[PDB]
């Protein structure tokens with residue numbers, strides 16, 4: 294076979310240890326999920342906007358009492374107007390307050406006022422993978438593989454808890470002071486036992502079954518991993534067009550072309566992740582995540598060493614001190630106005 | 645190969 298006796302026994306034992314880990318992780322998650330206003334706005338100085346979206350922004354803030362820096366996501370309650378926008382915001386807070394994994398951002402506080410919802414997370418100063426990737430062009434395969442391995446382990450963890458992530462992309466992956474990944478933005482994450490039906494995500498990263506309005510499962514995350522690995526290694530994603538409608542047509546076609554510099558091992562992995570037929574997509578078969586972890590492209594990956602953060606990272610972001618924002622792009626700054634009248638109080642009672 | 649090079653916004657219901 295491909296493995297000798299010693300290698301096969303080591304791999305098997307490793308897989309049983311994964312099961313043991315995930316069983317304990319589920320017990321810990323459920324405790325926080327079943328039995329979870331830990332601060333207020335004037336406890337922080339607002340420093341700089343780190344990113345912006347349709348419903349709000351993320352700001353670097355400094356806790357007045359302790360001097361610790363944090364990333365504060367601010368959502369305008371009125372802007373959270375559409376039905377699925379509201380439910381998704383409750384998903385995000387509840388999931389972040391219950392998960393625990395080395396590559397998932399840690400939530401520290403959450404609260405709300407008359408106008409906004411707030412989630413205060415650890416500040417990850419190394420910037421988004423997105424801007425490093427756009428600046429360098431593309432990552433070499435070993436560099437892309439180091440990041441991909443962290444996503445594989447993170448999705449193995451999330452999916453074991455029946456959590457789908459649903460917004461993988463370089464914009465949502467921050468690089469920490471040791472060069473490892475922190476997944477942020479859980480706005481589209483959801484606990485799903487089987488199928489779900491919401492049309493959501495980012496166009497370039499949508500699996501065909503989402504676009505086709507089919508009920509779908511956690512395999513959409515494995516498709517998105519294929520898109521991410523391709524984009525990291527090529528510098529652009531596999532389904533690339535100026536308008537969403539054209540992107541969708543490419544995704545559903547079932548056709549992918551690869552740069553001539555992609556290794557054959559990489560192309561094989563990507564053909565099995567970017568698989569329109571769900572009965573054939575890696576991550577969705579009887580062997581689950583192990584079809585990915587045991588693929589030849591990952592043969593050099595020490596999964597436990599990655600989890601334990603023992604592997605030397607390919608890139609360490611420069612940091613000039615606490616509160617440094619040099620690894621983030623600049624954004625238009627807008628005052629945080631809080632109305633004297635409570636908005637949407639009933640819609641956000643649970644937050 | 646024309647496509648979107650800037651930050652990409654997620655879509656909520658379409």
Ligand SMILES: COc1ccc(C[NH3+])cc1O
Nearest residue numbers: 344351364414464477478
């Ligand atoms: C720690 O959380 C965040 C930090 C930075 C961004 C911008 N990419 C979004 C976040 O949700």
